[PDB]
Design a protein around this nucleic acid. Structure first.
Ligand code: ZN
Lengths: 24, 121, 57, 213, 232
RNA sequence: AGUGGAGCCUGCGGCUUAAUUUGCACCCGGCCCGACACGGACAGGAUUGACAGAUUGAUAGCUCUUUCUCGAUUCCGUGGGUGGUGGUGCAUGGCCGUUGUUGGCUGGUUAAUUCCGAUGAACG
């Protein structure tokens, strides 16, 4: 986890990243 | 027509085990060494062509690459399109080629087809 | 004899032929892995199914 | 994984299991497992109890073996009958091993030794080799030398691959023979020199080498 | 060599004890065409777990063996990997990430896998997950090629994934080791494709990286692309 | 003593053919498969995997008919503009080898401590 972001101008998809490393 | 004193009608009835004496040495040894399965499939295709053809003209041609297959006495009535390198030479099976192979009816090479100085000064 | 690529036939609404009005127009596969929704292919002399080859002729 | 451990049969059985009940050694384990020996042909269990009988009995229970040598004699003879009727692999080998231990630590003894020597010409190599080592240990540890020497003479005179094995027996047993039986065995070896086979000749040369060495 | 395999081999995914059947069939002695057909059948019958285990146990060791032996991937095995990428979840979790985490990935396999990735279309969620997986592991020489080729796949990049990539770049300030310019090429690709998704403190972080870790040729181009970058 | 004379076969030439490989490219067939940009098709579903019968010289969904399934993992064409499991040469970090002395048996199998099968230390 990081500290900064892109801040403004909306989001489209939060992305599902926990379906790859959690398998093994 | 008779072959080695044996007519075609009894040749059809005369079976696989005692084919030895009516042949030459080479195909006798070839049959003694064990016949394979690919030429059996070729026999099956030839006879499948032989069934459903109407019986008042010559049946449909069966084509193959097999140049080295022993002609059985029961081949009389087939049409064999044997490869030569480029094309299929399709030939009628007469009763007279029982002892021969399929290679000598498919020639792989064409025949070969192959003025003097006079001083003036 | 160029290397042409086979094109899948865009059949128009191949989905909308296994149901009427309710029930199944085709049979249901009795398999353990799948079935009751995997439609049973019924060709003019035979049958053809999805996964584990439960085939009837 | 369970044979290389200290608690396994490689080390624990040899040291602490001979002390049955704190005193070494007791044949109460042997005296209560006749049910495995008779009317049971379960594989790999008779072999295991024969291995245990071979390994435990080696700690010289001489008065016990003297007093119940008769019981062990009939027990091992019915074992011989059962294994001849069945034809197993490991049970016969370790029961010949425990027979060897019994005969080394110790009329009935003569017939037990005769049976042990008769089960030496078995075609199976493990049984035959176990009987070979057993007869070698029993004779070298003798009033029974005449019996085994005349048995070897009669076994040669009755006859082809077992001749090499019993020639190895003769090679390991010529020095512990009486003089007349030494002369008879030398005459028999000289008779079998006449064959043109080289393997029996080499076995006889090694027997002569072990005798004269 | 050619033709069709017996159809009993194709009922292996329909079985329950498929691992024992796989061990009976001895996959280490298979040929390239047989393994290609096996990967095709395994990817054509769902069940991402068994496909991932097959890639972990069979396909990846064979790829390692013939790359170490013949110095090039096989033709039918290249097709096998292309067929395995048709199920991207099994291919990422079964081949790419374990080989990156092994720490002994060769450059030849790195270039081959990157060319396979750039041959194909990667889903945006799967590409972002791959980015996050690469950015979270330790640094290796061949991993920069994977990251650069995934970056010039040119997909949309989320918040946390891009920030994890940025801090992966920021994790190199105390490193006095000589650094390849391939890492700088991955960095230049990131800047060139995502200059509008770069905030301020990231930009001065990259300027102080270029000051701390300078390059004669490509670092001026990175400086130009950072200095002429519009935000938002 | 021969060859060069005759016959046999063998190499270069030459001639023939599909090739008469070479100082197996190919004959004749059948197979299999790069991104950049733009214009299209694309969940109406792009696409992957096929029961069968056969085309084929034989089979094979890699083929020719019949619809069953996986579903974005997409697939058609055009550019002298890049180009890629590209090939090749230079510099490059590690790593092998290259440039004395003294100790120390569950198993089946064969004649045979037979065959296979599990199974360490100092001194100069
Ligand atoms: Zn069904």
């Amino acid at each position: 986890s990081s500290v900064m972001r892109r801040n403004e101008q909306l989001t489209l998809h939060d992305e599902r990243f926990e379906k790859f490393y959690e398998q093994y | 027509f008779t072959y080695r004193g044996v007519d075609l009608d009894q040749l059809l009835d005369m079976s696989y085990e005692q084919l030895m004496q009516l042949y030459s040495a080479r195909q006798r040894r070839r049959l003694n060494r064990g016949l394979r399965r690919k030429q059996h499939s070729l026999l099956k295709r030839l006879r499948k062509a032989k069934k459903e053809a109407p019986p008042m003209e010559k049946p449909e041609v069966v084509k193959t690459h097999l140049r080295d297959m022993i002609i059985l006495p029961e081949m009389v009535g087939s049409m064999v399109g044997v490869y030569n390198g480029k094309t299929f030479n399709q030939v009628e099976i007469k009763p007279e080629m029982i002892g021969h192979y399929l290679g000598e009816f498919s020639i792989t090479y064409k025949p070969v087809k192959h003025s003097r100085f006079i001083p003036l000064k | 004899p160029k290397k042409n690529k086979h094109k899948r036939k865009k059949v128009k609404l191949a989905v909308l032929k296994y149901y009427k009005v309710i029930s199944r127009l085709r049979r249901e596969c009795p398999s353990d892995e799948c079935g009751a929704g995997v439609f049973m292919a019924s060709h003019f002399d035979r049958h053809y199914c999805g996964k584990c080859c439960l085939t009837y002729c | 994984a369970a044979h290389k451990e200290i608690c396994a049969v490689l080390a624990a059985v040899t040291e602490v299991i001979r002390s049955q009940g704190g005193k070494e050694t007791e044949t109460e384990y042997f005296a209560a497992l006749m049910t495995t020996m008779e009317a049971v042909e379960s594989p790999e269990s008779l072999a295991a109890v024969a291995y245990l009988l071979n390994l435990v009995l080696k700690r010289v229970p001489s008065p016990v073996l003297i007093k119940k040598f008769s019981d062990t004699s009939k027990a091992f003879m019915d074992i011989m009958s059962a294994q001849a009727s069945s034809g197993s692999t490991s049970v016969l080998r370790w029961v010949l091993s425990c027979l060897a231990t019994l005969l080394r630590k110790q009329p009935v003894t003569l017939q037990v030794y005769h049976g042990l020597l008769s089960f030496t010409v078995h075609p199976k190599p493990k049984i035959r080799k176990a009987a070979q080592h057993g007869v070698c240990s029993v004779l070298k540890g003798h009033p029974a030398a005449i019996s085994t020497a005349k048995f070897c003479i009669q076994e040669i005179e009755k006859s082809a691959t077992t001749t090499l094995h019993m020639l190895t027996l003769l090679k390991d047993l010529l020095p512990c023979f009486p003089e007349g039986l030494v002369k008879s065995c030398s005459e028999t070896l000289l008779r079998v020199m006449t064959l043109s086979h080289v393997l029996v000749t080499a076995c006889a040369m090694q027997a002569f080498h072990s005798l004269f060495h | 060599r050619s033709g069709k395999l017996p159809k009993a081999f194709k009922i292996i995914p329909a079985l329950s004890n498929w691992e024992q059947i796989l061990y009976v069939t001895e996959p280490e002695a298979w040929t390239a065409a047989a393994m290609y057909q096996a990967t095709r059948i395994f990817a054509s019958n769902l069940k991402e777990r068994m496909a991932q285990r097959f890639y972990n146990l069979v396909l990846l060791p064979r790829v390692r063996d013939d790359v170490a032996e013949y110095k090039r991937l096989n033709f039918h095995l290249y097709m096998a990997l292309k067929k395995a990428l048709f199920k991207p979840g099994a291919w990422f979790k079964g081949i790419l990430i374990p080989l990156c985490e092994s720490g002994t990935c060769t450059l030849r396999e790195a270039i081959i896998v990157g060319s396979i990735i750039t041959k194909c279309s990667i889903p945006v969620l799967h590409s972002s997950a791959a980015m996050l997986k690469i950015a979270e592991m330790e640094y290796s020489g061949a991993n920069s090629i994977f990251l650069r080729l995934l970056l010039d796949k040119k997909y949309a990049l989320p918040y946390r994934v891009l920030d994890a990539l940025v801090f992966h770049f920021l994790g190199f300030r105390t490193e006095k080791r000589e650094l390849p310019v391939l890492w700088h090429q991955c960095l230049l690709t990131l800047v060139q494709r995502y200059k509008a998704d770069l905030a301020t403190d990231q930009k001065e972080a990259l300027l102080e990286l270029l000051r701390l870790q300078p390059h004669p040729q490509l670092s001026p181009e990175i400086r130009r692309e950072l200095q002429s970058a519009v935000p938002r």
